[PDB]
Design a protein around this ligand. Structure first.
Ligand SMILES: *C(=O)[C@H]([C@@H](C)O)[C@@]1(C)CC(S[C@@H]2CN[C@H](C(=O)N(C)C)C2)=C(C(=O)O)N1
Length: 236
């Protein structure tokens, strides 16, 4: 198992506490510098957009065609669909969607699907940013695995729509879907890179500590390097 050694070697460069989890539908595997992160709960931050889009489309609070118009209050200073907002990571668009859903519906939907600790507190548009909603990397990886397979408790066409919002690139006929996250409001700060590769499916979740001034592109660069070494997503 020199593949594992090659992966671990990648993390010898990274000074931050990091775990990388993979899920192929049967096996959970863990790599990185602090493996206990995989079973620790952190705020989902921008990764919550996935569940937010799902709940919203499911409950007729938006469509994938609808334009969320900018209200003129100051980057993200333009009109976005939910898909455009996903890849741009436009928080205010998804805050608006959260406010359309409302605390009662949000709470019951998170409970219904068993997302993380299923806690929203009192602010319906901040709970994934400041807490108290938390989720383990293992939970995230299983979540996005089911999304890829269309086996979440949502309408099939809803899952397909949200799934394709996460599309990043393809190599041959292998497809990468991914969503990054950087929770700055919490201490310590958490970084996410969650997604999956469609050949069979391999879901993955990078989860690591972040500090002000860190390289924003590190999460993706690291994950792609890991996926290549695993042979899950080879470089072209
Ligand atoms: C969600 O993960 C996060 C939300 C909480 O803003 C988000 C969208 C911010 C970033 S980093 C982005 C790059 N430059 C900006 C900045 O320096 N600030 C503080 C305005 C923020 C990410 C990310 O995943 O990189 N996600």
């Amino acid at each position: 198992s020199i593949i594992d050694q090659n992966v671990q070697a990648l993390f010898n460069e990274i000074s931050a506490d990091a775990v990388f989890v993979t899920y192929d539908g049967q096996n959970i595997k863990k790599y990185g510098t602090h493996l206990d992160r995989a079973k620790t709960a952190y705020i989902p931050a921008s990764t919550f957009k996935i569940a937010n889009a799902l709940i919203g489309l499911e409950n007729h609070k938006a469509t994938s065609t609808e334009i969320f118009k900018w209200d003129g209050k100051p980057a993200w200073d333009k009109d976005f669909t939910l898909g455009e907002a996903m890849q741009a990571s436009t928080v205010p668009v998804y805050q608006e969607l959260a406010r359309r859903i409302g605390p009662s519906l949000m709470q019951s939907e998170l409970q219904r699907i068993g997302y993380g600790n299923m806690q929203i507190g009192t602010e319906v548009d901040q709970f994934w940013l400041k807490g108290p909603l938390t989720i383990t990397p293992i939970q995230e990886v299983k979540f996005v695995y089911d999304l890829a397979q269309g086996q979440l408790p949502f309408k099939p066409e809803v899952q397909q729509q949200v799934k394709e919002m996460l599309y990043v690139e393809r190599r041959g006929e292998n497809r990468l879907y991914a969503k990054s996250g950087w929770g700055m409001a919490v201490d310590p700060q958490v970084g996410w890179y969650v997604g999956f590769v469609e050949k069979q499916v391999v879901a993955f979740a990078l989860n690591m500590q972040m500090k002000a001034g860190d390289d924003i592109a590190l999460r993706k660069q690291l994950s792609l390097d890991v996926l290549d070494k695993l042979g899950v997503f080879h470089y072209l």
